[PDB]
């Protein structure tokens, strides 16, 4: 019953910015915090960051610090992710994810490929 | 209209049997 | 609830068992085998607690 549909794939030039959305339904968006994971084609998964959906407190990754920004719209039950100054190797399938009935991994999104 | 309820509504307060005793 | 924090802040599941005694006939008790009853002698009995 829980379904998460993300925004379409993006093709962009190096140095520019990209924003990816993911709509949520079938659960209380505020109750479960959102998580973002990156996976380059052929490489593994790397966690990107956390932002709670209740108060909005922040915990970013050191590697990606100063370039990533997540915001959430509680009224539309939709999560966003802003990423500026992209480079070539950051071309990857980007997932949004909330843990449900599990510590982690639940509800990985259909993925969004940003091609830089 | 109103009436006066006389000596009514008494029930067993504790479901423990007692006999030949006055219990408050 | 953070799984990356100090241990005294991680969630714990607590179940509180509150017992109401004498309130009604006894119905929830452990596995104890019963015996036959012996009359006209002082015996150390246990009837529903």
């Amino acid at each position: 019953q829980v379904q998460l549909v993300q925004s379409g794939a993006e093709v962009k030039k190096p140095g520019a910015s990209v924003k990816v959305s993911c709509k949520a339904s079938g659960y209380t968006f505020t109750s479960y915090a959102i998580s973002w994971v990156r996976q380059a084609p052929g490489q593994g998964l790397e966690w990107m960051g956390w932002v709670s959906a209740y108060n909005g407190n922040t915990n970013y990754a050191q590697k990606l610090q100063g370039r990533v920004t997540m915001t959430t719209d509680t009224s539309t039950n939709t999560a966003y992710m802003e990423l500026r100054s992209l480079r070539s190797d950051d071309t990857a399938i980007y997932y949004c994810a909330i843990p449900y009935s599990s510590v982690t991994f639940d509800c990985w999104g259909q993925g969004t490929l940003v091609t830089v | 209209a109103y009436t006066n309820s006389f000596t009514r509504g008494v029930y067993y307060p504790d479901k423990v049997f007692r006999s030949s005793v006055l219990h408050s | 609830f953070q799984p990356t924090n100090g241990v005294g802040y991680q969630p714990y599941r607590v179940v509180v068992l509150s017992f109401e005694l004498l309130h009604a006939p006894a119905t929830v008790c452990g596995p104890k085998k019963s015996t036959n009853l012996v009359k006209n002698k002082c015996v150390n009995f246990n009837f529903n607690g």
């Binding site: 994971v37 593994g44 998964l45 966690w47 510590v103 982690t104 991994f105 990985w108 259909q110 | - | -």
Partner: protein, 107 residues
């Protein structure tokens, strides 16, 4: 930071026999604060085992995971034709959780 290494990149085994996978850590990780992942081709990753011993909902008993501290092992008893996919190991004991690189099973 805690780095992960899986010794077999690909294992070439006929369906029916015994397969073993390794994934160790560099700094000690609590056993409870662990999970294991199976990512099908073209599908989102799926949690096979969490807590390093406990299966999730809908996981066949042929799978099982074990290990504690730094060294961890995934067990597959019977290889079915649909099982041939890629498997990820992940620990979240302290701060940033680190994922695995993957292991492919070949017929």
């Amino acid at each position: 930071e805690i780095v992960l290494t899986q010794s077999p990149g690909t294992l070439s085994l006929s369906p029916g026999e015994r397969a073993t996978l390794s994934c160790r850590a560099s700094q000690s990780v609590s056993g409870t604060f662990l999970a294991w992942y199976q990512q099908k081709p073209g599908q989102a990753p799926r949690l096979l085992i969490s807590g390093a011993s406990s299966r999730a909902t809908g996981i066949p008993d042929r799978f099982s995971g074990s290990g504690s501290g730094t060294d961890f092992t995934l067990t597959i008893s019977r290889l079915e034709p649909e099982d041939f996919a890629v498997y990820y190991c992940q620990q979240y004991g302290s701060s940033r959780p680190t994922f695995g690189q993957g292991t492919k099973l070949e017929i």
